From a paper:
Arginase (Arginine amidinase; EC 3.5.3.1) is one of the enzymes involved in the final step of the urea cycle. In this study, we have shown that zmARG catalyzed the arginine-hydrolyzing activity in a manganese ion-dependent manner and the dimeric state is formed by a novel helix-swapping manner.
The refined structure shows four molecules in the asymmetric unit of the C2 space group. The elucidated crystal structure of zmARG shows a common arginase fold with a protruding α-helix at the C-terminus that mediates a dimerization of the protein. The refined zmARG structure has shown two strong spherical electron densities in the pocket of each α/β hydrolase fold, which were modeled as zinc ions, based on the X-ray absorption near edge structure (XANES) and a fluorescence scan. The deep pocket with the two metal-binding sites of zmARG is lined with residues of the arginase-forming conserved sequence motifs of 89GGDCL93, 116DSHPD120, and 210HIDLDVLDP218. The first zinc ion is coordinated with five atoms of Sγ of Cys92, three Oδs of Asp116, Asp120, and Asp212, and the metal-bridging water molecule, which forms a distorted trigonal bipyramid configuration. Furthermore, the first zinc ion of zmARG forms a trigonal bipyramid by five ligands while the second one is octahedrally coordinated by six ligands, which is different from two metal ions of an octahedral geometry in other arginases. Notably, the C-terminal tail including the α10-helix (Trp273-Glu284) of each protomer ptotrudes outside from the globular α/β hydrolase fold and interacts with the open hydrophobic pocket on the surface formed by the two α-helices (α1 and α9) and the central β-sheet of the neighboring molecule. Based on the assays with deprivation of the metal ions taken from the expression host and loading metal ions into the active site, it can be argued that zmARG is also a manganese ion-dependent arginase like other arginases.
Residue numbers in the entry:
A (entry chain A): 5 to 290
B (entry chain D): 4 to 289
Write the structure that this text describes.
């Protein structure tokens, strides 16, 4: 067995500098690694704004980091991947690798308030594109790297609620299964039935931390200090708590072999503000 | 030459709250690189075994041992300045006592806190509420006996304090301790600047209790504990300042006096702790 942990502090897919610290802090908080560790080279945020590049903010650097993530994976030819992001787009190369290795026996359990199936026609921040790209849909600079696109029947989106009209149509068109926060709480029966009926032997788990209720976990986008009610376009916000997500992941991993785990979209507002405070205070560091 | 010392002091027993330990380690990781020497006070990690009240003080004996060891580490370096990454507020006892021995009545103590920390075991069993009084030579003899040069009360300024308890209002009045309210801080901190000028404060020790911060905007303090109710903390005063107010205040004061001490205390990073435990419990990484 050969696991690889990828520290992937990508922040450009969500155009939000604090993802970088969020990935480094996630890495610091994590248990000791079981196998190999690599960090994907990501330029630190400098305050210079990213620009839209043919409909995608930061297109060029995202393609570079996607290429470098794949190179680091190939270097270790791992059978399992833990990805410490970073915005949701960090899962593209890791889950593409797992699709090449495990093919139609892989299922993708996408734990997110949102389905991440938009394209640059709908949204300029690429962290909303990644699950669609794993199906081979969307912007070809990204889908060209996906050699074994996942069937929509081998996806389960858990924690999703109140989807946008585009997203509900996409989910409906492609027959993609979902599992609401309510059904996660009541035992995640759709996830168990899906693993059995779609013969999911290997499992890639993506945890977008914004599946979590921001009232109880305050290091996600929707817990940004000083926010107003409509600051995020009234898109869906998290309704699960950490024990719900842990239980769901362990339920699914008990009836299939977990080979992927991504933790994405950590936005540690307190740690960021504390880091900046210490930099600005007298004496310390000076 | 000037000899600085950074003291990492993950004491959690003074506030009887295990997450202070992680709070100190995280603060050390978030801080800029140290300029001089670094020591870490050995503190036993919380084991879940509850601390006991010992003659009116929770965890009395281990707090005395940690005080003695912190003093030893300071005297090993005989530093001219000290940065203390706590830890509950009691971590400032040995560092500020040393600074008082060195700088004597030329030192002012700027205590940035929602609370004055002048209680004794008669009022409160958690020793983090005792430390400023002990620096004045008041209170429990196991702690005051270590303070060779007690600070005179006119060389104290408590900034960010509001709505004190009756015992504390009487203590402050009887000893003529100067204060500065959150509102006065936001309007320019005129009481603090006046105090530096009028008392001719030449050297400055700054204690920052992070619970001076409004828990609505900084969520890593006691009063931002997820799921709290309104009266869980006895309706004691809660923080009203924001991080930019504290940074400005500290830099105002250090612009007209020589900063020789800085303590950052009472960090309780609820999100980091909850994420750390989540990762330990998840498949593949846990
Ligand atoms: Zn996502
Ligand atoms: Zn999301
Ligand atoms: Zn305090
Ligand atoms: Zn306090």
């Amino acid at each position: 067995n050969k696991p690889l942990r990828l520290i992937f502090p990508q922040w450009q897919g969500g155009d939000n500098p604090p993802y970088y610290l969020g990935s480094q802090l996630l890495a610091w908080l994590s248990p000791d690694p079981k196998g190999a560790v690599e960090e994907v080279p990501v330029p630190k945020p400098t305050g210079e704004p990213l620009q839209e590049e043919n409909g995608i903010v930061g297109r060029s650097i995202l393609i570079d980091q996607l290429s470098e993530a794949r190179q680091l994976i190939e270097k270790h030819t791992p059978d399992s991947l833990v990805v410490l992001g970073g915005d949701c787009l960090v899962s593209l190369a890791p889950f593409s690798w797992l699709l090449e290795k495990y093919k139609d026996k892989l299922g993708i359990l996408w734990i997110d308030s949102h389905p991440d199936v938009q394209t640059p026609k709908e949204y300029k921040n690429a962290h909303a594109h990644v699950l669609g790209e794993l199906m081979g849909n969307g912007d070809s600079d990204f889908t060209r790297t996906v050699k074994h696109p996942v069937s929509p029947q081998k996806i389960m989106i858990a924690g999703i609620h109140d989807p946008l009209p585009y997203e509900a149509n996409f989910i409906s068109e492609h027959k993609i299964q979902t599992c609401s926060p309510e059904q996660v709480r009541s035992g995640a029966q759709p996830v168990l039935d899906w693993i059995k009926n779609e013969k999911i032997e290997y499992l890639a788990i993506h945890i977008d931390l914004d599946v979590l209720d921001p009232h109880n976990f305050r290091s996600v986008l929707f817990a940004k200090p000083g926010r107003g009610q409509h600051d995020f376009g009234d898109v869906a916000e998290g309704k699960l708590n950490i024990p719900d997500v842990v239980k769901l992941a362990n339920q699914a991993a008990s009836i299939s072999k977990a080979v992927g785990l991504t933790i994405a979209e950590h936005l540690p507002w307190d740690a960021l503000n504390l880091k900046n405070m210490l930099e600005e205070l007298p004496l310390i560091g000076k």
